[PDB]
PDB file of C-alpha atoms in Angstrom:
ATOM      1  CA  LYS A   1       4.054 -27.751 -38.268  1.00  0.00           C
ATOM      2  CA  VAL A   2       2.235 -26.475 -41.366  1.00  0.00           C
ATOM      3  CA  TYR A   3       4.464 -24.076 -43.323  1.00  0.00           C
ATOM      4  CA  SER A   4       7.775 -25.641 -44.431  1.00  0.00           C
ATOM      5  CA  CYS A   5       6.394 -29.172 -43.957  1.00  0.00           C
ATOM      6  CA  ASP A   6       6.706 -31.517 -46.916  1.00  0.00           C
ATOM      7  CA  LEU A   7       3.482 -31.425 -48.961  1.00  0.00           C
ATOM      8  CA  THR A   8       2.914 -35.229 -49.126  1.00  0.00           C
ATOM      9  CA  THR A   9       3.813 -35.601 -45.444  1.00  0.00           C
ATOM     10  CA  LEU A  10       1.371 -32.871 -44.395  1.00  0.00           C
ATOM     11  CA  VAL A  11      -1.625 -34.256 -46.378  1.00  0.00           C
ATOM     12  CA  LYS A  12      -0.905 -37.813 -45.117  1.00  0.00           C
ATOM     13  CA  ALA A  13      -0.771 -36.514 -41.529  1.00  0.00           C
ATOM     14  CA  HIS A  14      -4.197 -34.890 -41.949  1.00  0.00           C
ATOM     15  CA  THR A  15      -5.837 -37.426 -44.315  1.00  0.00           C
ATOM     16  CA  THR A  16      -7.004 -34.525 -46.509  1.00  0.00           C
ATOM     17  CA  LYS A  17      -6.683 -34.214 -50.330  1.00  0.00           C
ATOM     18  CA  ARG A  18      -4.639 -31.036 -49.959  1.00  0.00           C
ATOM     19  CA  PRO A  19      -3.222 -28.744 -47.235  1.00  0.00           C
ATOM     20  CA  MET A  20      -5.697 -26.753 -45.148  1.00  0.00           C
ATOM     21  CA  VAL A  21      -3.707 -23.579 -46.014  1.00  0.00           C
ATOM     22  CA  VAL A  22      -4.427 -24.099 -49.711  1.00  0.00           C
ATOM     23  CA  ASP A  23      -8.169 -24.783 -49.367  1.00  0.00           C
ATOM     24  CA  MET A  24      -8.738 -22.087 -46.722  1.00  0.00           C
ATOM     25  CA  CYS A  25      -6.813 -19.325 -48.512  1.00  0.00           C
ATOM     26  CA  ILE A  26      -8.403 -20.061 -51.891  1.00  0.00           C
ATOM     27  CA  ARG A  27     -11.870 -20.116 -50.282  1.00  0.00           C
ATOM     28  CA  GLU A  28     -11.242 -16.669 -48.650  1.00  0.00           C
ATOM     29  CA  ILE A  29      -9.780 -15.331 -51.861  1.00  0.00           C
ATOM     30  CA  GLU A  30     -12.653 -16.565 -54.049  1.00  0.00           C
ATOM     31  CA  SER A  31     -15.284 -15.222 -51.658  1.00  0.00           C
ATOM     32  CA  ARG A  32     -13.860 -11.709 -51.447  1.00  0.00           C
ATOM     33  CA  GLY A  33     -11.132 -10.958 -53.946  1.00  0.00           C
ATOM     34  CA  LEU A  34     -11.680 -12.184 -57.544  1.00  0.00           C
ATOM     35  CA  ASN A  35     -12.321  -8.578 -58.633  1.00  0.00           C
ATOM     36  CA  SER A  36      -9.560  -6.967 -56.543  1.00  0.00           C
ATOM     37  CA  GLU A  37      -7.060  -5.077 -58.722  1.00  0.00           C
ATOM     38  CA  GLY A  38      -3.645  -6.749 -59.098  1.00  0.00           C
ATOM     39  CA  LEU A  39      -4.689  -9.840 -57.165  1.00  0.00           C
ATOM     40  CA  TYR A  40      -1.465 -11.925 -56.420  1.00  0.00           C
ATOM     41  CA  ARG A  41       0.838  -9.162 -57.731  1.00  0.00           C
ATOM     42  CA  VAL A  42      -0.009  -6.628 -55.031  1.00  0.00           C
ATOM     43  CA  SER A  43       1.756  -7.379 -51.779  1.00  0.00           C
ATOM     44  CA  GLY A  44      -0.043  -7.181 -48.476  1.00  0.00           C
ATOM     45  CA  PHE A  45       2.041  -6.126 -45.464  1.00  0.00           C
ATOM     46  CA  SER A  46       4.812  -8.701 -44.953  1.00  0.00           C
ATOM     47  CA  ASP A  47       4.249  -8.809 -41.169  1.00  0.00           C
ATOM     48  CA  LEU A  48       0.540  -9.548 -41.496  1.00  0.00           C
ATOM     49  CA  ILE A  49       1.354 -12.359 -43.895  1.00  0.00           C
ATOM     50  CA  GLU A  50       3.824 -13.755 -41.327  1.00  0.00           C
ATOM     51  CA  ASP A  51       1.008 -13.562 -38.794  1.00  0.00           C
ATOM     52  CA  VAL A  52      -1.253 -15.714 -41.011  1.00  0.00           C
ATOM     53  CA  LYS A  53       1.593 -18.245 -41.215  1.00  0.00           C
ATOM     54  CA  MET A  54       1.868 -18.214 -37.400  1.00  0.00           C
ATOM     55  CA  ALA A  55      -1.881 -18.827 -37.164  1.00  0.00           C
ATOM     56  CA  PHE A  56      -1.905 -21.822 -39.496  1.00  0.00           C
ATOM     57  CA  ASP A  57       1.182 -23.217 -37.807  1.00  0.00           C
ATOM     58  CA  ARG A  58      -0.562 -22.923 -34.438  1.00  0.00           C
ATOM     59  CA  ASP A  59      -4.193 -23.742 -35.253  1.00  0.00           C
ATOM     60  CA  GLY A  60      -4.195 -25.661 -38.547  1.00  0.00           C
ATOM     61  CA  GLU A  61      -7.730 -25.892 -39.957  1.00  0.00           C
ATOM     62  CA  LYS A  62      -8.938 -23.793 -36.982  1.00  0.00           C
ATOM     63  CA  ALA A  63      -6.906 -20.697 -38.041  1.00  0.00           C
ATOM     64  CA  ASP A  64      -8.894 -17.472 -38.326  1.00  0.00           C
ATOM     65  CA  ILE A  65      -8.229 -15.779 -41.720  1.00  0.00           C
ATOM     66  CA  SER A  66     -11.567 -13.933 -41.895  1.00  0.00           C
ATOM     67  CA  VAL A  67     -12.126 -10.386 -43.106  1.00  0.00           C
ATOM     68  CA  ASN A  68     -12.435  -9.441 -39.402  1.00  0.00           C
ATOM     69  CA  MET A  69      -8.901 -10.564 -38.622  1.00  0.00           C
ATOM     70  CA  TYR A  70      -7.349  -9.468 -41.922  1.00  0.00           C
ATOM     71  CA  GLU A  71      -9.302  -6.925 -43.956  1.00  0.00           C
ATOM     72  CA  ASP A  72      -6.848  -6.673 -46.877  1.00  0.00           C
ATOM     73  CA  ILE A  73      -7.252  -9.669 -49.163  1.00  0.00           C
ATOM     74  CA  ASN A  74      -3.663  -9.227 -50.349  1.00  0.00           C
ATOM     75  CA  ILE A  75      -2.609 -10.578 -46.953  1.00  0.00           C
ATOM     76  CA  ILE A  76      -4.277 -13.879 -47.905  1.00  0.00           C
ATOM     77  CA  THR A  77      -2.822 -14.092 -51.410  1.00  0.00           C
ATOM     78  CA  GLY A  78       0.497 -13.228 -49.654  1.00  0.00           C
ATOM     79  CA  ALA A  79       0.013 -16.110 -47.162  1.00  0.00           C
ATOM     80  CA  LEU A  80      -0.783 -18.579 -49.908  1.00  0.00           C
ATOM     81  CA  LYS A  81       2.233 -17.661 -52.025  1.00  0.00           C
ATOM     82  CA  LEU A  82       4.456 -17.880 -48.914  1.00  0.00           C
ATOM     83  CA  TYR A  83       3.028 -21.343 -48.276  1.00  0.00           C
ATOM     84  CA  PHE A  84       4.259 -22.634 -51.634  1.00  0.00           C
ATOM     85  CA  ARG A  85       7.535 -20.684 -51.182  1.00  0.00           C
ATOM     86  CA  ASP A  86       8.092 -22.514 -47.870  1.00  0.00           C
ATOM     87  CA  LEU A  87       7.690 -26.033 -49.315  1.00  0.00           C
ATOM     88  CA  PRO A  88      10.933 -28.073 -48.936  1.00  0.00           C
ATOM     89  CA  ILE A  89      10.112 -29.750 -52.221  1.00  0.00           C
ATOM     90  CA  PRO A  90       8.390 -27.244 -54.480  1.00  0.00           C
ATOM     91  CA  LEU A  91       4.895 -27.794 -55.861  1.00  0.00           C
ATOM     92  CA  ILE A  92       6.504 -28.711 -59.190  1.00  0.00           C
ATOM     93  CA  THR A  93       9.119 -31.015 -57.759  1.00  0.00           C
ATOM     94  CA  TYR A  94      12.878 -31.106 -58.421  1.00  0.00           C
ATOM     95  CA  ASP A  95      12.326 -34.494 -60.070  1.00  0.00           C
ATOM     96  CA  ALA A  96       9.518 -33.466 -62.413  1.00  0.00           C
ATOM     97  CA  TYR A  97      10.863 -29.974 -63.146  1.00  0.00           C
ATOM     98  CA  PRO A  98      13.011 -30.961 -66.211  1.00  0.00           C
ATOM     99  CA  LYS A  99       9.904 -32.373 -68.016  1.00  0.00           C
ATOM    100  CA  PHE A 100       8.091 -29.044 -67.464  1.00  0.00           C
ATOM    101  CA  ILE A 101      11.049 -27.116 -68.886  1.00  0.00           C
ATOM    102  CA  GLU A 102      11.152 -29.578 -71.797  1.00  0.00           C
ATOM    103  CA  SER A 103       7.547 -28.636 -72.500  1.00  0.00           C
ATOM    104  CA  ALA A 104       8.347 -24.917 -72.279  1.00  0.00           C
ATOM    105  CA  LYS A 105      10.951 -25.300 -75.036  1.00  0.00           C
ATOM    106  CA  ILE A 106       8.590 -26.899 -77.575  1.00  0.00           C
ATOM    107  CA  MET A 107       7.397 -24.547 -80.338  1.00  0.00           C
ATOM    108  CA  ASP A 108       4.391 -26.567 -81.575  1.00  0.00           C
ATOM    109  CA  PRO A 109       1.432 -25.801 -79.224  1.00  0.00           C
ATOM    110  CA  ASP A 110      -0.086 -29.280 -79.472  1.00  0.00           C
ATOM    111  CA  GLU A 111       3.109 -31.224 -78.829  1.00  0.00           C
ATOM    112  CA  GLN A 112       3.903 -28.709 -76.048  1.00  0.00           C
ATOM    113  CA  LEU A 113       0.544 -29.476 -74.372  1.00  0.00           C
ATOM    114  CA  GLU A 114       1.172 -33.191 -74.731  1.00  0.00           C
ATOM    115  CA  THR A 115       4.588 -32.928 -73.033  1.00  0.00           C
ATOM    116  CA  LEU A 116       3.013 -30.728 -70.301  1.00  0.00           C
ATOM    117  CA  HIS A 117       0.482 -33.523 -69.716  1.00  0.00           C
ATOM    118  CA  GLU A 118       3.357 -36.030 -69.275  1.00  0.00           C
ATOM    119  CA  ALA A 119       5.175 -33.683 -66.878  1.00  0.00           C
ATOM    120  CA  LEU A 120       2.010 -33.576 -64.758  1.00  0.00           C
ATOM    121  CA  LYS A 121       2.013 -37.399 -64.512  1.00  0.00           C
ATOM    122  CA  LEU A 122       5.562 -37.311 -63.046  1.00  0.00           C
ATOM    123  CA  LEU A 123       4.414 -35.331 -59.987  1.00  0.00           C
ATOM    124  CA  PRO A 124       3.582 -37.221 -56.779  1.00  0.00           C
ATOM    125  CA  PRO A 125      -0.244 -37.507 -56.230  1.00  0.00           C
ATOM    126  CA  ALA A 126      -0.435 -34.837 -53.526  1.00  0.00           C
ATOM    127  CA  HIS A 127       1.572 -32.376 -55.665  1.00  0.00           C
ATOM    128  CA  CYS A 128      -0.582 -33.087 -58.717  1.00  0.00           C
ATOM    129  CA  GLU A 129      -3.790 -32.606 -56.711  1.00  0.00           C
ATOM    130  CA  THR A 130      -2.751 -29.314 -55.097  1.00  0.00           C
ATOM    131  CA  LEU A 131      -1.473 -28.001 -58.442  1.00  0.00           C
ATOM    132  CA  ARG A 132      -4.796 -28.982 -60.108  1.00  0.00           C
ATOM    133  CA  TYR A 133      -6.775 -27.092 -57.462  1.00  0.00           C
ATOM    134  CA  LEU A 134      -4.497 -24.046 -57.589  1.00  0.00           C
ATOM    135  CA  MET A 135      -4.681 -23.949 -61.398  1.00  0.00           C
ATOM    136  CA  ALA A 136      -8.521 -24.153 -61.389  1.00  0.00           C
ATOM    137  CA  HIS A 137      -8.490 -21.183 -58.978  1.00  0.00           C
ATOM    138  CA  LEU A 138      -5.940 -19.227 -61.030  1.00  0.00           C
ATOM    139  CA  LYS A 139      -8.042 -19.787 -64.158  1.00  0.00           C
ATOM    140  CA  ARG A 140     -10.998 -18.158 -62.312  1.00  0.00           C
ATOM    141  CA  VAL A 141      -8.761 -15.228 -61.342  1.00  0.00           C
ATOM    142  CA  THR A 142      -7.857 -14.662 -65.019  1.00  0.00           C
ATOM    143  CA  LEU A 143     -11.608 -14.815 -66.049  1.00  0.00           C
ATOM    144  CA  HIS A 144     -12.012 -11.744 -63.846  1.00  0.00           C
ATOM    145  CA  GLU A 145      -9.247  -9.800 -65.678  1.00  0.00           C
ATOM    146  CA  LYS A 146     -11.591  -6.977 -66.733  1.00  0.00           C
ATOM    147  CA  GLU A 147     -11.790  -6.140 -63.037  1.00  0.00           C
ATOM    148  CA  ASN A 148      -8.513  -7.478 -61.502  1.00  0.00           C
ATOM    149  CA  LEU A 149      -6.129  -6.730 -64.389  1.00  0.00           C
ATOM    150  CA  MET A 150      -4.535 -10.185 -64.006  1.00  0.00           C
ATOM    151  CA  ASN A 151      -4.132 -12.605 -66.914  1.00  0.00           C
ATOM    152  CA  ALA A 152      -2.275 -15.940 -67.254  1.00  0.00           C
ATOM    153  CA  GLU A 153       0.892 -14.081 -68.310  1.00  0.00           C
ATOM    154  CA  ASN A 154       0.829 -11.714 -65.264  1.00  0.00           C
ATOM    155  CA  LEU A 155       0.201 -14.634 -62.893  1.00  0.00           C
ATOM    156  CA  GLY A 156       3.031 -16.597 -64.547  1.00  0.00           C
ATOM    157  CA  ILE A 157       5.365 -13.752 -63.467  1.00  0.00           C
ATOM    158  CA  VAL A 158       4.282 -14.145 -59.846  1.00  0.00           C
ATOM    159  CA  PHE A 159       4.067 -17.923 -59.688  1.00  0.00           C
ATOM    160  CA  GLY A 160       6.895 -19.089 -61.969  1.00  0.00           C
ATOM    161  CA  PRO A 161       9.737 -18.714 -59.378  1.00  0.00           C
ATOM    162  CA  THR A 162       7.469 -19.858 -56.458  1.00  0.00           C
ATOM    163  CA  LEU A 163       6.178 -23.178 -57.843  1.00  0.00           C
ATOM    164  CA  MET A 164       9.512 -24.150 -59.425  1.00  0.00           C
ATOM    165  CA  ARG A 165      13.194 -23.753 -58.530  1.00  0.00           C
ATOM    166  CA  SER A 166      16.055 -23.598 -61.011  1.00  0.00           C
ATOM    167  CA  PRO A 167      19.173 -25.578 -60.067  1.00  0.00           C
ATOM    168  CA  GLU A 168      21.142 -23.861 -62.777  1.00  0.00           C
ATOM    169  CA  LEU A 169      24.084 -21.593 -62.312  1.00  0.00           C
ATOM    170  CA  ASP A 170      24.776 -20.015 -65.716  1.00  0.00           C
ATOM    171  CA  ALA A 171      23.707 -16.460 -66.680  1.00  0.00           C
ATOM    172  CA  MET A 172      21.957 -16.973 -70.058  1.00  0.00           C
ATOM    173  CA  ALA A 173      20.375 -20.222 -68.918  1.00  0.00           C
ATOM    174  CA  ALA A 174      19.172 -18.592 -65.658  1.00  0.00           C
ATOM    175  CA  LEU A 175      17.284 -15.832 -67.436  1.00  0.00           C
ATOM    176  CA  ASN A 176      15.952 -18.518 -69.767  1.00  0.00           C
ATOM    177  CA  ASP A 177      14.657 -20.697 -66.899  1.00  0.00           C
ATOM    178  CA  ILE A 178      12.923 -17.675 -65.370  1.00  0.00           C
ATOM    179  CA  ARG A 179      11.033 -17.111 -68.636  1.00  0.00           C
ATOM    180  CA  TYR A 180      10.336 -20.822 -69.109  1.00  0.00           C
ATOM    181  CA  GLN A 181       8.920 -21.131 -65.560  1.00  0.00           C
ATOM    182  CA  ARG A 182       6.592 -18.221 -66.237  1.00  0.00           C
ATOM    183  CA  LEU A 183       5.483 -19.901 -69.532  1.00  0.00           C
ATOM    184  CA  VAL A 184       4.853 -23.233 -67.703  1.00  0.00           C
ATOM    185  CA  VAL A 185       2.583 -21.370 -65.289  1.00  0.00           C
ATOM    186  CA  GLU A 186       0.846 -19.493 -68.100  1.00  0.00           C
ATOM    187  CA  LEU A 187       0.190 -22.719 -70.028  1.00  0.00           C
ATOM    188  CA  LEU A 188      -1.091 -24.516 -66.885  1.00  0.00           C
ATOM    189  CA  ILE A 189      -3.593 -21.720 -66.111  1.00  0.00           C
ATOM    190  CA  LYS A 190      -4.771 -21.341 -69.709  1.00  0.00           C
ATOM    191  CA  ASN A 191      -5.211 -25.094 -70.298  1.00  0.00           C
ATOM    192  CA  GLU A 192      -6.129 -26.266 -66.844  1.00  0.00           C
ATOM    193  CA  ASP A 193      -9.464 -27.535 -68.167  1.00  0.00           C
ATOM    194  CA  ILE A 194      -7.802 -29.984 -70.631  1.00  0.00           C
ATOM    195  CA  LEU A 195      -4.647 -30.773 -68.608  1.00  0.00           C
ATOM    196  CA  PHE A 196      -6.480 -31.874 -65.460  1.00  0.00           C
TER     197      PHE A 196
END
Protein backbone atom coordinates (compact mmCIF):
# COMPACT_ATOMS: atom_id res chain seq x y z
CA LYS A 1 0.00 0.00 0.00
CA VAL A 2 2.45 2.65 1.22
CA TYR A 3 6.00 1.25 1.30
CA SER A 4 7.20 -0.02 -2.11
CA CYS A 5 4.52 1.99 -3.93
CA ASP A 6 5.72 4.27 -6.71
CA LEU A 7 6.25 7.79 -5.33
CA THR A 8 4.20 9.66 -8.00
CA THR A 9 1.45 7.04 -7.84
CA LEU A 10 1.20 7.29 -4.05
CA VAL A 11 0.99 11.13 -3.93
CA LYS A 12 -1.59 11.15 -6.78
CA ALA A 13 -3.68 8.55 -4.90
CA HIS A 14 -3.69 10.76 -1.79
CA THR A 15 -3.73 14.22 -3.44
CA THR A 16 -0.92 15.30 -1.10
CA LYS A 17 2.34 17.11 -2.04
CA ARG A 18 4.41 14.25 -0.64
CA PRO A 19 3.96 10.84 1.04
CA MET A 20 2.51 10.79 4.55
CA VAL A 21 5.52 8.67 5.65
CA VAL A 22 7.89 11.49 4.69
CA ASP A 23 5.97 14.31 6.39
CA MET A 24 5.11 12.28 9.50
CA CYS A 25 8.61 10.88 10.08
CA ILE A 26 10.31 14.24 9.53
CA ARG A 27 7.82 15.92 11.90
CA GLU A 28 8.56 13.30 14.64
CA ILE A 29 12.27 13.56 14.00
CA GLU A 30 12.34 17.37 14.11
CA SER A 31 10.26 17.50 17.29
CA ARG A 32 12.41 15.07 19.26
CA GLY A 33 15.70 14.19 17.63
CA LEU A 34 17.68 17.07 16.04
CA ASN A 35 20.18 16.88 18.93
CA SER A 36 20.34 13.07 19.15
CA GLU A 37 23.89 11.78 18.61
CA GLY A 38 24.50 10.05 15.26
CA LEU A 39 21.03 10.83 13.96
CA TYR A 40 20.48 8.75 10.69
CA ARG A 41 23.74 6.80 11.18
CA VAL A 42 22.65 5.00 14.34
CA SER A 43 20.33 2.11 13.60
CA GLY A 44 17.23 1.51 15.65
CA PHE A 45 16.15 -2.13 16.07
CA SER A 46 15.38 -3.56 12.61
CA ASP A 47 12.17 -5.25 13.84
CA LEU A 48 10.75 -2.04 15.31
CA ILE A 49 11.45 -0.29 12.03
CA GLU A 50 9.58 -3.08 10.20
CA ASP A 51 6.72 -2.49 12.63
CA VAL A 52 6.55 1.21 11.67
CA LYS A 53 6.38 0.11 8.02
CA MET A 54 3.52 -2.26 8.89
CA ALA A 55 1.71 0.61 10.62
CA PHE A 56 1.97 3.01 7.70
CA ASP A 57 1.00 0.26 5.29
CA ARG A 58 -2.09 -0.46 7.40
CA ASP A 59 -3.13 2.99 8.63
CA GLY A 60 -1.56 5.54 6.27
CA GLU A 61 -1.80 9.05 7.75
CA LYS A 62 -3.46 7.52 10.85
CA ALA A 63 -0.32 5.50 11.81
CA ASP A 64 0.89 5.99 15.38
CA ILE A 65 4.65 6.82 15.43
CA SER A 66 4.59 8.74 18.73
CA VAL A 67 7.18 8.58 21.48
CA ASN A 68 4.67 6.38 23.37
CA MET A 69 4.71 3.71 20.68
CA TYR A 70 8.39 4.03 19.77
CA GLU A 71 10.62 5.73 22.33
CA ASP A 72 13.89 5.47 20.36
CA ILE A 73 13.98 8.14 17.66
CA ASN A 74 16.38 5.98 15.64
CA ILE A 75 13.39 3.76 14.88
CA ILE A 76 11.84 6.71 13.02
CA THR A 77 14.97 7.69 11.10
CA GLY A 78 15.20 3.92 10.33
CA ALA A 79 11.59 3.90 9.02
CA LEU A 80 12.18 6.92 6.84
CA LYS A 81 15.35 5.56 5.27
CA LEU A 82 13.58 2.22 4.65
CA TYR A 83 10.79 4.15 2.94
CA PHE A 84 13.17 5.60 0.35
CA ARG A 85 14.96 2.22 0.11
CA ASP A 86 11.62 0.58 -0.76
CA LEU A 87 10.78 2.95 -3.64
CA PRO A 88 10.55 1.05 -6.98
CA ILE A 89 11.96 4.12 -8.68
CA PRO A 90 14.43 5.78 -6.34
CA LEU A 91 14.01 9.36 -5.13
CA ILE A 92 16.69 10.38 -7.63
CA THR A 93 15.29 8.44 -10.55
CA TYR A 94 17.06 6.06 -12.94
CA ASP A 95 16.40 8.61 -15.69
CA ALA A 96 17.79 11.66 -13.90
CA TYR A 97 20.64 9.83 -12.15
CA PRO A 98 23.27 10.32 -14.95
CA LYS A 99 22.87 14.16 -14.74
CA PHE A 100 23.53 14.01 -10.97
CA ILE A 101 26.67 11.93 -11.54
CA GLU A 102 27.70 14.38 -14.28
CA SER A 103 27.49 17.12 -11.66
CA ALA A 104 29.53 15.07 -9.18
CA LYS A 105 32.38 14.84 -11.69
CA ILE A 106 32.72 18.60 -12.24
CA MET A 107 35.68 20.22 -10.46
CA ASP A 108 34.56 23.87 -10.63
CA PRO A 109 32.09 24.46 -7.73
CA ASP A 110 29.95 26.97 -9.63
CA GLU A 111 29.55 24.92 -12.80
CA GLN A 112 28.96 21.86 -10.57
CA LEU A 113 26.09 23.68 -8.80
CA GLU A 114 24.66 24.74 -12.14
CA THR A 115 24.65 21.15 -13.45
CA LEU A 116 23.11 19.99 -10.12
CA HIS A 117 20.33 22.53 -10.69
CA GLU A 118 19.68 21.04 -14.17
CA ALA A 119 19.66 17.49 -12.75
CA LEU A 120 16.96 18.60 -10.30
CA LYS A 121 14.78 19.82 -13.21
CA LEU A 122 14.91 16.32 -14.79
CA LEU A 123 13.15 14.74 -11.79
CA PRO A 124 9.38 14.21 -11.94
CA PRO A 125 7.47 16.85 -9.83
CA ALA A 126 6.68 14.50 -6.94
CA HIS A 127 10.33 13.35 -6.74
CA CYS A 128 11.59 16.93 -6.86
CA GLU A 129 9.16 18.01 -4.12
CA THR A 130 9.97 15.15 -1.73
CA LEU A 131 13.71 15.63 -2.32
CA ARG A 132 13.35 19.39 -1.62
CA TYR A 133 11.58 18.69 1.68
CA LEU A 134 14.05 15.98 2.71
CA MET A 135 17.01 18.24 1.89
CA ALA A 136 15.57 21.16 3.93
CA HIS A 137 15.23 18.72 6.85
CA LEU A 138 18.74 17.29 6.37
CA LYS A 139 20.16 20.82 6.32
CA ARG A 140 18.54 21.39 9.76
CA VAL A 141 20.08 18.14 11.01
CA THR A 142 23.56 19.35 9.97
CA LEU A 143 22.98 22.77 11.73
CA HIS A 144 22.72 20.73 14.92
CA GLU A 145 26.12 19.02 14.37
CA LYS A 146 27.59 20.36 17.63
CA GLU A 147 25.07 18.11 19.36
CA ASN A 148 24.31 15.29 16.85
CA LEU A 149 27.79 14.88 15.31
CA MET A 150 26.25 14.71 11.81
CA ASN A 151 27.40 16.92 8.94
CA ALA A 152 26.58 16.92 5.20
CA GLU A 153 29.47 14.51 4.55
CA ASN A 154 28.29 11.98 7.23
CA LEU A 155 24.71 12.15 5.94
CA GLY A 156 25.96 11.68 2.36
CA ILE A 157 27.41 8.32 3.52
CA VAL A 158 24.00 7.21 4.78
CA PHE A 159 21.84 8.63 2.01
CA GLY A 160 24.00 8.24 -1.11
CA PRO A 161 23.15 4.52 -1.77
CA THR A 162 19.49 4.96 -0.59
CA LEU A 163 18.40 7.89 -2.80
CA MET A 164 20.29 6.65 -5.87
CA ARG A 165 21.07 3.27 -7.44
CA SER A 166 24.08 2.49 -9.61
CA PRO A 167 23.40 0.34 -12.68
CA GLU A 168 27.09 -0.19 -13.19
CA LEU A 169 28.93 -3.45 -12.99
CA ASP A 170 32.64 -2.60 -13.05
CA ALA A 171 34.87 -2.52 -9.93
CA MET A 172 36.64 0.87 -10.21
CA ALA A 173 33.51 2.56 -11.53
CA ALA A 174 31.39 1.03 -8.72
CA LEU A 175 33.56 2.45 -5.96
CA ASN A 176 33.52 5.72 -7.90
CA ASP A 177 29.70 5.83 -8.10
CA ILE A 178 29.48 5.18 -4.35
CA ARG A 179 31.67 8.23 -3.69
CA TYR A 180 29.87 10.34 -6.30
CA GLN A 181 26.44 9.49 -4.80
CA ARG A 182 27.68 10.57 -1.38
CA LEU A 183 28.99 13.86 -2.92
CA VAL A 184 25.61 14.48 -4.67
CA VAL A 185 23.91 14.13 -1.29
CA GLU A 186 26.48 16.35 0.43
CA LEU A 187 26.08 19.08 -2.21
CA LEU A 188 22.25 18.89 -2.05
CA ILE A 189 22.23 19.31 1.76
CA LYS A 190 24.82 22.09 1.78
CA ASN A 191 23.18 24.09 -1.03
CA GLU A 192 19.56 23.23 -0.51
CA ASP A 193 18.78 26.91 0.06
CA ILE A 194 20.01 27.94 -3.44
CA LEU A 195 19.11 24.73 -5.33
CA PHE A 196 15.44 24.70 -4.31
